[PDB]
Amino acid sequence: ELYTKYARVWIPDPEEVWKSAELLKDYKPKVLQLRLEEGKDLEYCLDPKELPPLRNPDILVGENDLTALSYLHEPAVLHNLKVRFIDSKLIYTYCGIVLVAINPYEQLPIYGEDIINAYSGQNMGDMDPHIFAVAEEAYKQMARDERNQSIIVSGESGAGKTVSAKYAMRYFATVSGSANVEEKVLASNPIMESIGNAKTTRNDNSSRFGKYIEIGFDKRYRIIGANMRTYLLEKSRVVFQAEEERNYHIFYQLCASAALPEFKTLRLGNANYFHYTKQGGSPVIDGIDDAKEMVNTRQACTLLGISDSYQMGIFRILAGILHLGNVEFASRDSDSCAIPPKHDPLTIFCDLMGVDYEEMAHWLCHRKLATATETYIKPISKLHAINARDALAKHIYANLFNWIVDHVNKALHSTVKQHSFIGVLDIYGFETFEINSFEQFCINYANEKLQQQFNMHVFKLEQEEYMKEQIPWTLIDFYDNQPCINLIEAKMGVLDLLDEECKMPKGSDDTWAQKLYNTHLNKCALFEKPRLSNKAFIIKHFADKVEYQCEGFLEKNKDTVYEEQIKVLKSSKKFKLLPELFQDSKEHKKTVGHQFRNSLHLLMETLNATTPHYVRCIKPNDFKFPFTFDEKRAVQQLRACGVLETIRISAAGFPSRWTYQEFFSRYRVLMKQKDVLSDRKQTCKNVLEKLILDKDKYQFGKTKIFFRAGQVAYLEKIRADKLRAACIRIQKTIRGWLMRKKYMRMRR
Amino acid sequence: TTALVCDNGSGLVKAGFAGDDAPRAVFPSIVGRPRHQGVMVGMGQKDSYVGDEAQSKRGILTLKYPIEHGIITNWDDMEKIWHHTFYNELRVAPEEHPTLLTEAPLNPKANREKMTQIMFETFNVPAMYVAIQAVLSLYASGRTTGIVLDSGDGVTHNVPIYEGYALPHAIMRLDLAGRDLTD
Ligand SMILES: [Mg+2]
């Protein structure tokens, strides 16, 4: 078998996720005598059943493409990335069609202009990997064929998705022949960060929305202009945060500037004075001056042609939302509530907005039913009043965000008709915490959908390559996460029961969880209950199992916005912007989970129109050190980017492909002169068919041999054995012949 | 597809789409026939009127209520009122939408049998259900426990419910009514 003395294996180690070992005695069917670097010798148990991951030979190690490796597993990937990053400083790497980008914190020269002209024209394999090579593969496919092209970037927001997009756009600008898309888009970045980024337990300045830039090309492939869109914004953060989190930066940047004279009208307090900002208990981010980021946000608005009148509108509305948060209801009786007399937050909210105090005070505590012929003003419980107030705050914020994006688009557009576009998606990756909640559940459902699209695209490209190479295409195995998507989104799924429990009377997180267990507990292999608790459930995702706690879900999922409260706000006359937000029913009833599922279906409609190209970003160390690679963090990021599962899916197939001449060159050491023949293709077909017994392992394509995982390592090992033994025989013969001559010399 | 929700009674008919905040069609449930000799020629004399039409003309008409005491007591007029409800007043074909129908408890079984038979055969409704009025009042008022007292035209009935279980032995029914208050 493949286990021999003088062979290498990976062993699990809690300090560094895998450790290298050498085998001291050949295996034969319950313990191995394992060498190490950490001392000479060790005795290592096998487990009831398992053998360690066997290590690839060092011709394949450090290749530019992870699927050149003959064994494919987490240790080989982690090692190969670590050696490329640490030893050669090659941050870019390939995996199938994906480009893995490992973020150095140090700056590099490699982005410099000339390299743009060096990569341009070159087919994707003909050059070592770099972000320009994907930017070209898009630009070339756009020029060659009708279709638009898309580039999709995933990873924790520190990883540098924005830097990858920025350089892709520089590539486009420099090849296309420009003006001032790039400078404007990067000027927009601080605004979209300020209103869309957030601070999460694992990460400061996380981005809670998916942001899409459509770079527009003329029919001459001149850059016209750009168009921006945003998807999957999480509204729930606005009203509610977990411990050690903040809601969107802009509220803190606004409160930090309370001293400034133009803000004085807002009567802003300390950032933990209000109810929406205080709940996380974490007002100050370590190592940031918020007032400086405020000044940079304002200057970016000015640079995008939002006049100071509109900027004071934006901050006026945000201060309105903050003051609205403090409004506090007293219950008269269990089904009725009222606002106390001359309540200071409501008075300030009405002053800031212009709406007359009596109308807000009346509508916040009642709702209106109307048939066509009659209309009833009905009191509502303090809980329903609070839910309505929070839904109104979420609705104001979501419309303010959509408005600021409409103005950014107004700056980015240009008049010439767009012939085709190339579109660069910055999104968040798969996400898991000690505590997982409705936000993580929506993020994971979005990532399940994106991963489904990726898997289908890879499967299509590989079917086309197999039909091209005359292999039976029925062999290739397709792996489908549709059963999970159906678990989350189909009727009587998790989201659909959550929406039912919202409306059903006396709903709760306990009765929701009980409905989950009744509906799924043993009917679906992917749904599981944690044994020791009844308030949680487990979904087996693409990457990993994830416990989700129920305690947040129903409080966060509820939106309903009472039409009269909007009709009050829309009526206000004090300033232009607040009527301008709400300008153009059933949508008001929709829950946040349903608005999210609709936004994700819009995103999937936008991507399905287009041929994708992928980038993954991984964050190599937790502390921004320039080149330190932490194998624990990189393992977690490689799982969260689905690279390891992609590699698993690939390792099932034929991952490794060789051209007949390059094979013939390498294995001429194995080949015998009688086997050499006037047709090298037939020669290799014969030699290989002898060398590897089971034809299931390999296929003969028109121009390439295909191998299952390990077979190239098998050939390389038999080559190293044969070449070693032949070298031993020749060496011992030469040593004997010379020393025998020295024997004869001593005789003489 | 949004199911229809239809609530019949003596007195008003209330119908609308599920998920709406309030009923889309409300009209008194009457079928009326003329009782005078039509003198003008080309008037467009009509065999009978339903709902608001029968109310406006009513001085000319005999008005007959096809439901007394929550029981449908002539099926032709009731089927006319459903015809008017789906085609004229909601303007939506029943072959698209499930339908939900409402009845007072402790009614005869034949009333449910005939009402379902007419829904499947005569309107071809793809699916239907029949709910109890008192149970639905608890959904509307936002509770899973209470004793409902519900009194319309025709039947008055109490139904106690405790955490989503009815208590059939405690159900009470009475025939005091808006109608007997009128008489
Ligand atoms: Mg009734």
From Swiss-Prot, chain A:
Positions contributing to ATP binding: 155-162
GO MF annotation terms: actin filament binding; ATP binding; ATP hydrolysis activity; calmodulin binding; microfilament motor activity; minus-end directed microfilament motor activity
Superkingdom in the source lineage: Eukaryota
Any one Gene Ontology BP term: vesicle-mediated transport
This protein's GO CC annotations: actin cytoskeleton; cytoplasm; filamentous actin; Golgi membrane; insulin-responsive compartment; membrane; myosin complex
Similarity annotation: Belongs to the TRAFAC class myosin-kinesin ATPase superfamily. Myosin family.
Protein name: Unconventional myosin-Va
Organism: Gallus gallus (Chicken)
Taxonomic lineage from the root: Eukaryota, Metazoa, Chordata, Craniata, Vertebrata
Gene giving rise to this polypeptide: MYO5A
Covered range of the whole protein: 5 to 792 of 1829
Curated annotation (Swiss-Prot), chain B:
Cell compartment(s), UniProt: Cytoplasm, Cytoskeleton
Post-translational modification N6-methyllysine, affected residues: 80
Positions of region (Interaction with alpha-actinin): 106-119
PTM annotation (Methionine (R)-sulfoxide): residues: 40, 43
Residues bearing the modification Tele-methylhistidine: 69
Positions of modified residues (N6-malonyllysine): 57
Domain of life the protein comes from: Eukaryota
Reported modifications of this chain: Oxidation of Met-40 and Met-43 by MICALs (MICAL1, MICAL2 or MICAL3) to form methionine sulfoxide promotes actin filament depolymerization. MICAL1 and MICAL2 produce the (R)-S-oxide form. The (R)-S-oxide form is reverted by MSRB1 and MSRB2, which promotes actin repolymerization. Can be mono-ADP-ribosylated on Arg-173 by SpvB of Salmonella spp. This modification blocks subsequent polymerization and leads to cell death.
Modified positions (ADP-ribosylarginine) in chain numbering: 173
Note: In vertebrates 3 main groups of actin isoforms, alpha, beta and gamma have been identified. The alpha actins are found in muscle tissues and are a major constituent of the contractile apparatus. The beta and gamma actins coexist in most cell types as components of the cytoskeleton and as mediators of internal cell motility.
Subunit: Polymerization of globular actin (G-actin) leads to a structural filament (F-actin) in the form of a two-stranded helix. Each actin can bind to 4 others. Interacts with alpha-actinin. Identified in a complex composed of ACTA1, COBL, GSN and TMSB4X. Interacts with TTID. Interacts (via its C-terminus) with USP25.
Family assignment from sequence similarity: Belongs to the actin family.
Protein function: Actins are highly conserved proteins that are involved in various types of cell motility and are ubiquitously expressed in all eukaryotic cells.
Protein name as catalogued: Actin, alpha skeletal muscle
Residue span relative to the full protein: 7 to 189 of 377
